[PDB]
């Protein structure tokens, strides 16, 4: 009884991930399907930070505040 | 008047869209403002309208009509698309006036 | 009256503050205590949808009318939202401040919230959240509040991904009818007459109920979460409870924040006076950014250290910063450094006030918080009245307090809270 | 209490000249703080390709030690008085700025004079900041917009000192030495091309006395009469395309030759830029936006963002539009942008012209709200116009602007002109130069 299936009764298919690399002779129960998950929007790539002088100033020291506007860009201040 | 309601009911029966189960707001032509009104319709009204149009198309394919008791009548011909369509017309007239300015 | 600020309070609880400085640009702000604090688990993101729905069709002006009229004036309409409060700010020429105030109060007091409009706007909610989370500090601060509080401040300032597609116009109307009430708003103005301000106050804002729903007092919980996302730098915020807005303890905590380093004053500098940066740079050879995070609210505060470092050196940076704050709590400090911190705080507050946008924001925040004007001279007086013993007490309170940690990055060497 | 009365009530700045020709200007407000800065008329337009990163090196090394205060002592004094410190450099200008209180003005001006006069450049600090510049060049190469603007500047002002970027090439950064920095300091940091600008709770008499105390000896004379000179830089119609399809978005900037600083068409072209407008994907306007380009961008979902720029240099400028979009909307966005440009060029209406004028009023006053932008405006105005243009004069120019002369000036500057195009990213959809020119003339007008 040195195994997850022989110890956890209903938690065996939860603790054990089974992958059929080759399709079996018998059909499997609960085949499942991906219901067309959405894609996050494509945005501009934020710059990386490689030197400490340009790294300074980006550690937050104030409460988070958001700002939207009719004709001004939505900014966030830290 | 009392004469006007009876004449309107007779003309409504002569129109013939009640015999296929339609309503007036169903039978009005789908222009741009009408399309905006249907987009602004709630889900239940949109589903009932879509089923009514589909059943009407099936009936006209079969060259038949609904039975007499199942025809819609003048008193319960609800005008569901009327406020949405009126608001779309008002907004389009506002945009037209701003374009005129 | 350019010499002072005219200040009145209506019998329904509304606050009216005005200053006639004869500025070419006139500003009108409406400050409401209707932030993300006042949401329970059932209507999360309603504040975000309201903030993005501040340009919809209203009972008095359509969305097309609002947009075209405001951009024909050329003035600006904006919403600035915190956890505590929202601010609806309009600015424009003095000749068109009347119609700008009409648009502002039409979009605040009576929005229709048509369901097709919010159905089209929830995609804009998703896009705005993505743009806000383009940088990682927003995510770190949101996670920090979420693990610091049980309720009323753990609510995210941005709409959850599941709640996108679920926020209804009924929920928006419920939120507005329960929180957009007269006793919790303040209508402030720069370059406008107090008579005009009070006239439009009783012309629009007279028909709202009262105090409305209170809140949930924001109980503290502590704990930690760690988002491993494989980023090139590791962000880590370790905070604890502090005082609320309106306390000498909160003033001491702000002085302590500026003593440990609230950020750089010099572009591309070494930050030679900030004790956190000095202590980290004593034993590091990597890029880093360490600062004192401070965020007070109406009933609770958060004070701690924010560190951005490399993946391998994150533990060393966090330990050095924590040992520096531990030394401050033990009492390793000088009165000259405390005076320099107070001078930094005075300069920062005065530079916040010097801009008319910041001045309007401070006026509205003070009107919502205390219901009275505290002059900058008196603010600097109490800032100077902060003592260094209270700074040591605040540092000891942060050291001894229960910890909340939000970390993100590649955390193979980032320590845990029990290891600190 | 009208707009013109308020602009009359705006306080007037004061300008004075020292004995060495250094300009000293001040605007007094009721603010408790002050912004004191030094603007030097020097930059990449004066660099001659051998010291192409000298200004960037100097603004990195001016705060890392001086003769009187060595190493970090100036930083210690700045943090002790609580002042914010800043610097930047554009292709014509180099600015140092200090935001502080009104009671620390002598210390602020002494620190500014010591920075611009007695900057000690140690070789170890030179090497350290050289490594910093290499890392920062890598970071700015990773930044999408700066690459496109540098590409646009190069492909528009090629063969001239205006093509080279402010940071300079990495070869010149690595091979630049201390003697080149001393040559740049002794050649370009002259007295009469310096403006000491103060804005806020500052008295012009006290500022002039402090400038006489500190900035009197700047050595305006030249080493062997090696006086430089302003040379015109040609504008050319051209494009650069850095195709790299792995990047998510495409940045495209299209510009034409500008009017210059002293040209009175700047107000008209800024009004036209207000007509075209700007948009970001997070804008709350939606379909009902007054700008028709932004409206069609929302309606067709073309661009992530676009903006209109009018960058002006001595008798030249880059004037155009920069947009970030996906890889499948570049052609449509170029088409719509050129269509809006020539709608402005051919059929401009008084209603939209008044809308853009009011937008420009709001933009100028909102920019000039604040001590630091007032100081920046003072410095740039004295460096470019030779004087500070008052808000009443600006408003008079906007009153002079109407639809007919806007139409004439737009037809002068946009219509049938060869543009400069800078594209970066998946720009296969971006049209050819011939297609861009064919959009840059209409067959119906």
Write A11-18 long-range contacts (CB < 8 A, 24+). Answer: none
Q: Is D367 on the interface with A (CB under 8 A)?
A: no
| Cβ under 8 Å to D: A residues 2-41 | none
Rounded CA separation C42/C155 (Å): 11
Do chains D and A have 3 or more beta-carbon pairs under 8 angstroms? yes
Short-list D33, A9, A74, CA closest to C157:
A74
**B39 contacts in chain C (CB < 8 Å):** 116
Bridge partners (DSSP) listed for residue D16: D24
**What are the tokens at D189?**
């940091």
Per CB-CB distance under 8 Å, the chain C contacts of D79 are: 265-266, 272-274, 340, 344
Residue D100 and residue D108: Cα distance in Å, rounded?
A: 8
Please tell me the distance from the alpha carbon of residue C145 to that of residue C103, in angstroms, as a whole number.
Answer: 35
* Beta-carbon separation of C115 and B95 below 8 A: no
Give contacts of C 45-104 with A, CB under 8 A.
Answer: 51-52, 54-55, 66-67, 70-71, 76-83
CB pairs under 8 A between A and D: 57
Which experimental approach was used here? Answer: cryo-EM
Measured in Å, how far apart are chain A's first and last C-alpha atoms? 55
Structure tokens at D342: 């020539």
Are C262 and C290 contacting, i.e. CB atoms less than 8 angstroms apart? no
- Among C172, C177, C199, C34, residue whose Cα is nearest residue C113: C172
Interface probe, candidates A48, A51, A68, chain D, greatest D C-beta count within 10 A: A51
Of C52, C267, C344, the CB nearest to D85: C267
Q: Which residues of D are catalytic?
A: 59
SS3 for C231-271, per residue? CCCEEEEEEEEECCCCCHHHHHHHHHHHHHCCCCCECCCCC
Task: Tell me the nearest-neighbour CA distance from C13 into chain D, angstroms.
Answer: 31
Q: What is the DSSP letter of C220?
A: B
CB contact under 8 A, C158 and A66: yes
Nearest one of C285, C225, C153, C273 to C414, comparing CA atoms? C225
Q: Which residues of A fall within a CB distance of 8 Å from D304?
A: 43-44
Calpha distance D233→D255 (Å, rounded): 16
> Which chain A residues are closer than 8 Å to C292 by Cβ?
61
CB–CB contact A70 C67 (8 Å): yes
Chain D residues in contact with A66 (beta carbon < 8 A): none
- How far from D108 is each of C194, D35, D104, D236, CA to CA, in Å? 39, 9, 6, 44
What distances in angstroms separate CA C241 from CA C83, C215, C238, D308, one per listed residue?
16, 19, 11, 46
Contact at CB, A66 and C237, closer than 8 angstroms: no
Which of A39, A40, A57, A73 should be substituted to probe chain D, the one whose Cβ sees the most D Cβ atoms within 10 Å? A73
- Chain A residue numbers touching C81 (CB-CB < 8 A): 65-68
What whole-number distance in Å separates Cα of residue C63 and Cα of residue C121? Answer: 13
Q: How far is D80 from chain C (nearest CA, A)?
A: 5
Q: Please, are residues C89 and C28 in contact by the beta-carbon 8 Å criterion? A: yes
Show Cβ contacts of residue C50 under 8 Å, excluding neighbours closer than 6 positions: C34, C86, C172, C175, C176
Q: Which of C127, C134, C271 sits opposite A56 (nearest CB)?
A: C271
Which residue in the set A42, A49, A71 is minimally distant from D249, CB to CB? A42
| Residues whose CB is less than 8 angstroms from the CB of residue D264 and which lie 6 or more positions away in sequence, other chains included | D397
Q: Do C292 and A53 touch (CB under 8 A)?
A: no
Name the residue facing C267 among D86, D101, D354 (closest C-beta): D86
**Facing D304 at nearest CB: one of A44, A49, A51:** A44
Closest-CA distance, A39 to chain C, in angstroms, reads 11
| Unique residue bearing structure tokens 């709640």 | C163
Q: What is the 3-state secondary structure (H, E, C) of chain B?
A: CHHHHHHHHHHHHHHCCCCCCCCHHHHCCCCHHHHHHHHHCCHHHHHHHHHHHHHHHHHHHHCCCCCHHHCCCCCCCCCCHHHHHHHHHHHHHHHHHHHHC
Residue D371 · residue D29 · CB < 8 Å: yes
Neighbours of chain D (3+ CB pairs under 8 A): A, C
Crossing angle, helix C314-330 and helix C388-400, to 10 degrees? Answer: 130
CB C116 within 8 A of CB D286: no
* Nearest CB to B94; choose among C62, C114, C116: C62
User: If you search the block for the tokens 């890598």, which residue do you land on?
Assistant: D138
Give me the resolution in angstroms, 1 decimal. Answer: 3.5
Question: How many Cβ contacts (< 8 angstroms) between chains A and C?
Answer: 130
Chain A CB contacts of C308 below 8 Å: 49, 55, 58-59
Structure-token pair, residue C160? 């959850």
Q: In this complex, do C62 and B39 lie within 8 Å of one another by their Cβ atoms?
A: no
Burial class (CB in 10 A: 0-12, 13-18, 19+), D383: buried
Q: Are D371 and D306 in contact, with CB atoms under 8 Å apart?
A: no
Chain B nearest C-alpha distance from C116 (Å): 6
Interface of C with A in 122-151 (CB under 8 A): 126-128, 130-132, 134-135, 137-138, 140-142, 145
Look up residue D242 and give its DSSP letter. E
- Rounded Cα gap, residues D73 and C272, in angstroms: 9
Terminal-to-terminal C-alpha distance of chain D: 45
Chains that touch B (3 or more CB pairs under 8 A): C
**Which residues in chain C touch residue A68, judged by CB atoms under 8 angstroms apart?**
51-52, 54, 78-79, 81, 128
Tokens of residue D321, six digits: 């539009």
Those residues of chain C whose CB sits closer than 8 Å to some CB in chain B are 62, 64-65, 68, 114-116
Structure tokens given for C275:
């004790």
In angstroms, the CA C93 to CA D291 distance is: 20
């Amino acid at each position: 009884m040195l195994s997850v299936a022989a110890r956890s009764g209903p938690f065996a298919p939860v603790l054990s991930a089974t992958s059929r690399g080759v399709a079996g002779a018998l059909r499997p129960l609960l085949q499942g399907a991906v219901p067309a998950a959405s894609e996050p929007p494509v945005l501009d790539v934020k710059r990386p930070f490689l030197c400490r002088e340009s790294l300074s100033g980006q550690a937050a020291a104030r409460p988070l505040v958001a700002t939207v506007g009719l004709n001004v860009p939505a900014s966030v201040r830290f | 008047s009392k004469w006007l309601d009876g004449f309107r009911k007779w003309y409504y029966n002569a129109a013939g869209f009640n015999k296929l189960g339609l309503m007036r707001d169903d039978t009005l032509h789908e222009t741009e403002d009408v399309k905006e009104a249907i987009r602004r319709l709630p889900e239940d009204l949109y589903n009932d309208r879509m089923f009514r149009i589909k059943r009407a198309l099936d009936l006209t394919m079969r060259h038949q009509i609904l039975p007499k008791d199942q025809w819609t009548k003048y008193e319960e011909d609800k005008f569901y698309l009327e406020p949405y369509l009126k608001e779309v017309i008002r907004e389009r007239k506002e945009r037209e006036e701003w374009a005129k300015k | 009256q350019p010499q002072d600020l005219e200040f009145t309070k209506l019998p329904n609880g509304l606050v009216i503050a005005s200053l006639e400085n004869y500025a070419p640009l006139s500003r009108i702000g409406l400050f409401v205590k209707a932030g993300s604090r006042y949401e329970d688990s059932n209507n999360l993101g309603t504040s975000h949808l309201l903030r993005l729905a501040s340009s919809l069709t209203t009972k008095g002006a359509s969305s097309f009318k609002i947009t075209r009229g405001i951009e024909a004036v050329g003035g600006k309409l904006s919403v600035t939202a915190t956890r505590e409060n929202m601010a609806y700010t309009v600015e424009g020429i003095r000749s068109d401040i009347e119609i700008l105030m009409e648009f502002l109060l039409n979009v605040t007091t009576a929005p229709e919230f048509r369901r097709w409009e919010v159905a089209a706007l929830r995609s804009q909610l998703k896009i705005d959240k993505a743009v806000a989370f383009q940088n990682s500090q927003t995510r770190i601060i949101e996670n920090l509040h979420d693990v610091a509080y049980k309720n009323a401040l753990a609510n995210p300032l941005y709409c959850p991904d599941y709640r996108m597609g679920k926020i209804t116009s009924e929920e928006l109307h419920y939120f507005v009818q329960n929180h957009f009430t007269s006793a919790r708003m303040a209508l402030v103005g720069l370059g406008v007459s107090h008579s005009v301000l009070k006239q439009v106050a009783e012309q629009f804002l007279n028909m709202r109920g009262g105090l409305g729903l209170a809140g949930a007092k924001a109980k503290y919980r502590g704990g930690e979460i760690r988002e491993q996302n494989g980023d090139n730098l590791v962000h880590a915020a370790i905070v604890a409870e502090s005082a609320a807005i309106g306390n000498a303890e909160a003033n001491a905590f702000s002085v302590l924040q500026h003593l440990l380093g609230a950020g750089p004053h010099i572009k591309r500098g070494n930050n030679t006076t900030s004790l956190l940066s000095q202590s980290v740079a004593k034993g590091s050879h990597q890029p880093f950014d360490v600062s004192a995070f401070n965020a007070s609210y109406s009933d609770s505060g958060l004070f701690g250290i924010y560190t951005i470092s490399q993946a391998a050196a994150a533990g060393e940076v966090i330990n050095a910063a924590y040992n520096q704050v531990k030394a401050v709590a033990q009492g390793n400090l000088s009165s000259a450094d405390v005076q320099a911190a107070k001078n930094k705080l005075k300069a920062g507050y005065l530079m916040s006030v010097e801009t008319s946008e910041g001045f309007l924001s401070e006026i509205g925040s003070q009107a919502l918080a205390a219901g009275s004007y505290m002059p900058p001279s008196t603010v600097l007086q109490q800032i100077d009245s902060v003592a260094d013993a209270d700074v040591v007490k605040a540092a000891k309170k942060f050291v001894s307090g229960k910890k909340s940690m939000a970390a993100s990055g590649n955390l193979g060497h980032t320590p845990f809270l029990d290891e600190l | 209490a009208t707009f013109a009365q308020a602009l009359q009530s705006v306080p007037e700045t004061q300008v004075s000249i020292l004995d060495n020709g250094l300009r000293v200007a001040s605007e007094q407000s009721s603010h408790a703080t002050c912004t004191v800065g030094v603007w030097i008329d020097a930059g990449s337009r004066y660099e001659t390709e051998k010291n192409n990163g000298a200004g960037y090196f100097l603004e990195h090394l001016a705060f890392k030690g001086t003769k009187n205060r060595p190493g970090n002592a100036l930083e210690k004094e700045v943090e002790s008085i609580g002042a914010h410190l800043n610097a930047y450099s554009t292709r014509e200008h180099t600015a140092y700025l200090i935001k502080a209180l009104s009671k620390d003005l002598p210390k602020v001006v002494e620190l500014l004079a010591d920075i611009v006069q007695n900057s000690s450049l140690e070789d170890s600090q030179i090497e350290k900041e050289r490594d910093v510049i290499l890392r920062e060049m890598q970071e700015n190469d990773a930044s999408m917009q700066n690459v496109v603007f540098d590409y646009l500047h190069a492909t528009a002002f090629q063969g001239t000192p205006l093509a080279q970027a402010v940071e300079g090439p990495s070869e010149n950064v690595r091979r630049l030495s201390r003697t080149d920095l001393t040559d740049y300091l002794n050649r370009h940091y002259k007295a009469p091309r310096m403006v000491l600008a103060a804005a806020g709770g500052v008295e012009h008499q006290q500022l002039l006395d402090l400038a006489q105390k500190h900035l009197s000896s700047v050595s305006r004379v030249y080493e062997e009469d090696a006086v430089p000179g302003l040379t015109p830089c040609r504008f050319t119609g051209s494009e650069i395309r850095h195709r790299d399809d792995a990047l998510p978005l495409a940045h495209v900037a299209i510009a034409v030759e500008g009017p210059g600083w002293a040209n009175p068409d700047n107000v008209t072209l800024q009004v036209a830029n207000a007509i075209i407008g700007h948009y970001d994907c997070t804008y709350g306007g939606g379909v009902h936006l007054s700008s028709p380009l932004a409206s069609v961008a929302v309606a067709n979902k073309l661009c992530q963002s676009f903006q209109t720029f009018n960058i002006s240099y001595s008798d030249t400028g880059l004037l155009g539009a920069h947009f970030v979009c996906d890889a499948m909307s570049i052609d449509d966005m170029v088409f719509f942008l050129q269509g809006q440009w020539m709608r402005l060029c051919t059929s401009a209406t008084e209603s939209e012209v008044t809308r853009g004028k009011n937008i420009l009023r709001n933009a100028l006053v909102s920019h000039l709200d604040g001590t630091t932008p007032v100081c920046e405006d003072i410095g740039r105005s004295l460096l470019t116009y030779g004087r500070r243009i008052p808000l009443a004069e600006w408003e008079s120019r906007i009153q002079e602007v109407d639809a007919q002369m806007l139409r004439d000036i737009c037809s002068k500057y946009f219509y049938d002109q060869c543009p400069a195009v800078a594209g970066y990213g998946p720009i296969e959809q971006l049209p050819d130069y011939n297609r861009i020119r064919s959009g840059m003339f209409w067959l119906r007008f």
